[PDB]
Amino acid sequence: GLKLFITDDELKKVHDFEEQCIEEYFREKDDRFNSSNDERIRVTSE
Amino acid sequence: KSISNQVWKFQRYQLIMTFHERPVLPPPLIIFSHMTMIFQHLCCRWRGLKLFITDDELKKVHDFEEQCIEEYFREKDDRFNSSNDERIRVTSERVENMSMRLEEVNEREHSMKASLQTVDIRL
Amino acid sequence: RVENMSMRLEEVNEREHSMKASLQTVDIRL
Amino acid sequence: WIERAFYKRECVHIIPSTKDPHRCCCGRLIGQHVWSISKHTQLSPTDAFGTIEFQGGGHSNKAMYVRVSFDTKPDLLLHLMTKEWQLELPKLLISVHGGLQNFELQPKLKQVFGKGLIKAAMTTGAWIFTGGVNTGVIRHVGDALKDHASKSRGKICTIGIAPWGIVENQEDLIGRDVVRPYQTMSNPMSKLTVLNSMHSHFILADNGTTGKYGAEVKLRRQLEKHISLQKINTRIGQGVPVVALIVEGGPNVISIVLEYLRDTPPVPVVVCDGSGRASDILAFGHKYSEEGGLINESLRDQLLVTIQKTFTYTRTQAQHLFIILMECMKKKELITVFRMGHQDIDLAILTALLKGANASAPDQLSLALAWNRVDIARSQIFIYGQQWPVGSLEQAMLDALVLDRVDFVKLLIENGVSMHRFLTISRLEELYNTRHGPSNTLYHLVRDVKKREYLPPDYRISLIDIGLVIEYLMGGAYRCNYTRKRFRTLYHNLFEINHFPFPFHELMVWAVLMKRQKMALFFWQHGEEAMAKALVACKLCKAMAHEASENDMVDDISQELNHNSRDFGQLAVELLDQSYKQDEQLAMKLLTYELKNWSNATCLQLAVAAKHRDFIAHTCSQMLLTDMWMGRLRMRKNSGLKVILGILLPPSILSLEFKNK
Amino acid sequence: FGTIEFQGGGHSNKAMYVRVSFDTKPDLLLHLMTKEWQLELPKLLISVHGGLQNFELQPKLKQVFGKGLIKAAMTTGAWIFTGGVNTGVIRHVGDALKDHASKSRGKICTIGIAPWGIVENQEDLIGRDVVRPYQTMSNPMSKLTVLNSMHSHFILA
Amino acid sequence: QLAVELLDQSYKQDEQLAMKLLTYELKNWSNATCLQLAVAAKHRDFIAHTCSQMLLTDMWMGRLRMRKNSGLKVILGILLPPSILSLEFKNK
Known part of the structure; x- marks a missing residue:
């Protein structure tokens, strides 16, 4: 039930979804950091 | 308990809408009120919250409604632009505009x- | 004040x- | 299938000598050897397949490729890249023809042009043909896509047409369906040019020779002409529209620009100045030349001198290249310039691509609706003197509502929609039956109401069925206008009589049944009885949440319907709050009156029918419902006891105050 | 008679109007606009006499003069007499009232004295007590000049 | 909470790759899955997200669509073998 045997060509299309999730997620934490009340005024004073 | 006074306002509406439709005599003497309601209904058929708004006073309550629609989005745009968030969502672009404009000078x-x-x- | 430097410096x-x-x-x- | 359909070739015979015995005319060494003009190349099935996903300097993206002959079918590559490359057809097209040799640019100009090109690739979703090997214009656009396109939606679909022999490490690219890594170790002395690693797609145009250019040029031209031949689904113009960006370049840039301007269809050419060489001489031939031959002798002689000296070209053929430059000046409508000095080159390339297209203004509007660009549409398509045909703007509105485009319908109602004349019964039913948008659950609800009343997949849902859908969802004693006998006889007689005098309410029911919240707020913004419409939309949203909780599927739809329900409820709360702040005497009359388009009900009874919480707790309804208790009477000061004394003592009722009628 | 409440480019406000003779009583229009126009008497008065033909201005000067006029209309609560048809000085003050007066108390009470024949779509304005829509489709070749849509009141002299 | 937020993002991207991501076998991790290594790790908030909610709810129903006001309907099926025939089935 929870242990389906993923073949050699459908492991590739679920792996590239994983690393595209890794690069895309750190975009959102950098955008909320740069647009926060803290770090956006951590740039204006310089 | 943060909603206790509030939830009383829902159940009191159900009392008001029922008692508007109830016959005026008490449920003891409601044979009298049922007799006269059948009397007034049969004498014409065999022979509160629903006021009928006429065609000229629907216009003066409709234009109050669309003037409320345009005026309300003024207040949400003013509190947005004067908030701590969005007012500094504009200052950093302007300061960045002086970054290369003054350097060009x-x-x-x-x-x-x-x-x-x-x-x-x-x- | 920063908005005042927006068109004053641009005028310069x-x-x-x-x-x-x-x-x-x-x-x-x- | 790809190996058995695309064939490579390689020079395996003749073996001449060109100023060296080992230096073949086919490029490889004499020992390294194992078109057919004096080379005798042999056609064979291709061995170079798989992925060349890279390492080093980042850019470890999926980089699958294909190697084809120089004389190969453009259609066969077209079905390749549409079928087994997972690439849908683009809405635009841009090329990176330019200087093959390595150059450099000013930082601000490079940054502005690169940002403009990458955000053009983001907005249009186009395919970007590039030389492929990281040198000069290809290296600059590689730094450009790495500038901000890696920080904004890094699925650019850039395709690099490079020769098979010109790329470095040809033995590394041998192997069928094998993921061969390639390192970015740039050898400074190797003639085999390094690749641009963050390019997603590659083409290895194989002419059977090595280290020679010009073979991929003909393949690139036939592929782009075939791509322009493939008609787009909206069918705006001559297939997918195409435009060519030129930065630097040589005489080849001038010749292919003259080829593009004289081509069928007339593909426009964007030229960016400030970079030198061919782009600057095309810019100079465009700026002070007017109608092609309206060039004075002084600037013509100055252009001839700069060709002879700054371009280091022969003076004998300088007149020939001035004839070619005048030929480029003969078609200045396609020719575009970008003289710089937010606000990037996206608008410039957009109006360049939509300018020289030989297409109508509704065609350009359909193209802009495809690109999801409203500012470019406002600047270019909607201008003065535009003779818009009758019925085309209505078709543009139909396409705009079915694609769920809020800024486009804002621009369309800003440019004379006439929404009362636009909306009919048939257009509304076609609007409902259209499924060219986001996911929804109209089919399960219409199947449930058909099961309740008593379903094929091709069933066309009538307005009676959706009217009984709002009757099912709102519940109680709600009677929608679509189940009325008059509307049923009009439906029988027809399937401004067919037009709707109150269009925004059907826009509310279409917006809430199609899960389009942005449509619901925008069609809220214009119209009458807006409190009633927001309240009943809250009722339908809570009812759809009840249906999607009683069915409790993949719960994104149930959570967004709960979100829309409580948001529209607090919308009703804040509008009552504002009407209380404005004036109270119109406020209670607003909350009481009868609603002819909403089953002759009121705000309060539809509110409790919707089971909204905080609408009836405000002070306006507080004084309304308190005064609707007292009836025509003023006997309230310390009540409870006084009303008990009146009902027990009929004399004491006479000592109670009465409200004036 | 009726309302010519507009569509297109925003400005879907209440736009009731009246058509009178050129030789008509000023007092009769005065009791009209005080009684059944729901307009109380202003504390000041300002007119928009100016260039009838279409012109253009510098952006800063147009912005400053327009903001000054609209906040004068806010503070004094005055009545603003304008040519009415959106061209030149009328178009500039229409952009001016749309500049910040739409963002600050958009009940300006602007009245446009326009000729009955000079306005476009005269057949559209036929009908007594009928809310006739008018689209802002500006014909570049029609001599009948287009209207300024965000004006609240109109006079058809 | 890193595992929590990555599951959150994969839920926001698309669900059909998301449950397949949470189910498949891990050849470098003792042939186990995300869920069983999650409860082996005794992490709290990983399996409370809506992706695992619909995964574990659909892994209860098995190959079957008999859910609308459940509890009572499944009791009536297991007591009445005729009434199982009046229940919907998921397509294989």
Whole structure:
């Protein structure tokens, strides 16, 4: 039930979804950091 | 308990809408009120919250509604623009605009002051 | 105040281009 | 299938000598050897397949490729890249023809042009043909896509047409369906040019020779002409529209620009100045030349001198290249310039691509609706003197509502929609039956109401069925206008009589049944009885949440319906709050009156029918419902006891105050 | 008679109007606009006499003069007499009231004295007590000049 | 909470790759899955997200669509073998 045997060509299309999730997620934490009340005024004073 | 007074306002509405439709005599003497309601209904058929708004006073309550629609989005735009968030969502772009505009003035004013010195030398 | 420097400094930027060009034109004719 | 359909070739015979015995005319060494003009190349099935996903300097993206002959079918590559490359057809097209040799640019100009090109690739979703090997214009656009396109939606679909022999490490690219890594170790002395690693797609145009250019040029031209031949689904113009960006370049840039301007269809050419060489001489031939031959002798002689000296070209053929430059000046409508000095080159390339297209203004509007660009549409398509045909703007509105485009319908109602004349019964039913948008659950609800009343997949849902859908969802004693006998006889007689005098309410029911919240708020913004419409939309949203909780599927739809329900409820709360702040005397009359388009009900009874919480707790309804208790009477000061004394003592009722009628 | 409440480019406000003779009583219009126009008497008065033909201005000067006029209309609560048809000085003050008066108390009470024949779509304005829509489709070749849509009141002299 | 937020993002991207991501076998991790290594790790908030909610709810129903006001309907099926025939089935 929870242990389906993923073949050699459908492991590739679920792996590239994983690393595209890794690069895309750190975009959102950098955008909320740069647009926060803290770090956006951590740039204006310089 | 943060909603206790509030939830009383829901159940009191159900009492008001029922008692508007109830016959005026008590449920003891409601044979009298049922008799006269059948009396008034049969004498015409065999022979509160629902006021009928006429065609000229629907216009003066409709234009109050669309003027409320345009006026309300003014207040949400003003509290947005004057909030701590969005008012500094504009200042950093302007300061960044002075980052290369003033540096462009700094790049060419060196040539402008040098042009004044060179012209004064050749005069 | 920052909004006041938005068009005041831009007004300096509009006319300093003509001021530097006036210095170059005067130096050419001298 | 790809190996058995695309064939490579390689020079295996003749073996001449060109100023060296080992230096073949086919490029490889004499020992390294194992078109057919004096080369005798042999056609064979291709061995170079798989992925060349890279390492080093980042850019470890999926980089699958294909190697084809120089004389290969453009259609076969077209079905390749549409079928087994997972690439849908683009809405635009841009090329990176330019200087093959390595150059450099000013930082601000490079940054502005690169940002403009990458955000053009983001907005249009186009395919970007590039030389492929990281040198000069290809290296600059590689730095450009790495500038901000890696920080904004890094699925650019850039395709690099490079020769098979010109790329470095040809033995590394041998192997069928094998993921061969390639390192970015740039050898400074190797003639085999390094690749651009963050390019997603590659083409290895194989002419059977090595280290020679010009073979991929003909393949690139036939592929782009075939791509322009493939008609787009909206069918705006001559297939997918195409435009060519030129930065630097040589005489080849001038010749292919003259080829593009004289081509069928007339593909426009964007030229960016400030970079030198061919782009600057095309810019100079465009700026002061007017109608092609309206060039004075002084600037013509200056252009001839700069060709002879700055371009280091022969003066004998300088007149020939001035004839070619005048030929480029003969078609200045396609020719575009970008003289710089937010606010990037996206608008410039957009109006360049939509300018020289030989297409109508509704065609350009359909193209802009495809690109999801409203500012470019406002600047270019909607301008003065535009003779818009009758019925085309209505078709543009139909396409705009079915694609769920809020700024486009804002621009369309800003440019004379006439929404009362636009909306009919048939257009509304076609609007409902259209499924060219986001996911929804109209089918399960219409199947449930058909099961309740008593379903094929091709069933066309009538307005009676959706009217009984709002009757099912709102519940109680709600009677929608679509189940009325008059509307049923009009439906029988027809399937401004067919037009709707109150269009925004059907826009509310279409917006809430199609899960389009942005449509619901925008069609809220214009219209009458807006409190009633927001309240009943809250009722339908809570009812759809009840249906999607009683069915409790993949719970994104249930959570967004709960979100829309409580948001529209607090919308009703804040509008009552504002009407209380404005004036109270119109406020209670607003909350009481009868609603002819909403089953002759009121705000309060539809509110409790919707089971909204905080609408009836405000002070306006507080004084309304308190005064609707007292009836025509003023006997309230310390109540409870006084009303008990009146009902027990009929004399004491006479000592109670009465409200004036 | 009726309302010519507009569509297109925003400005879907209440736009009731009246058509009178050129030789008509000023007092009769005065009691009209005080009684059944729901307009109380202003504390000041300002007119928009100016260039009838279409012109253009510098952006800063247009912005400053327009903001000054609209906040004068806010503070004094005055009535603003304008040519009415959106061209030149009328178009500039229409952009001016749309500049910040739409963002600050958009009940300006602007009245446009326009000729009955000079306005476009005269057949559209036929009908007594009928809310006739008018689209802002500006014909570049029609001599009948287009209207300024965000004006609240109109006079058809 | 890193595992929590990555599951959150994969839920926001698309669900059909998301449950397949949470189910498949891990050849470098003792042939186990995300869920069983999650409860082996005794992490709290990983399996409370809506992706695992619909995964574990659909892994209860098995190959079957008999859910609308459940509890009572499944009791009536297991007591009445005729009434199982009046229940919907998921397509294989």
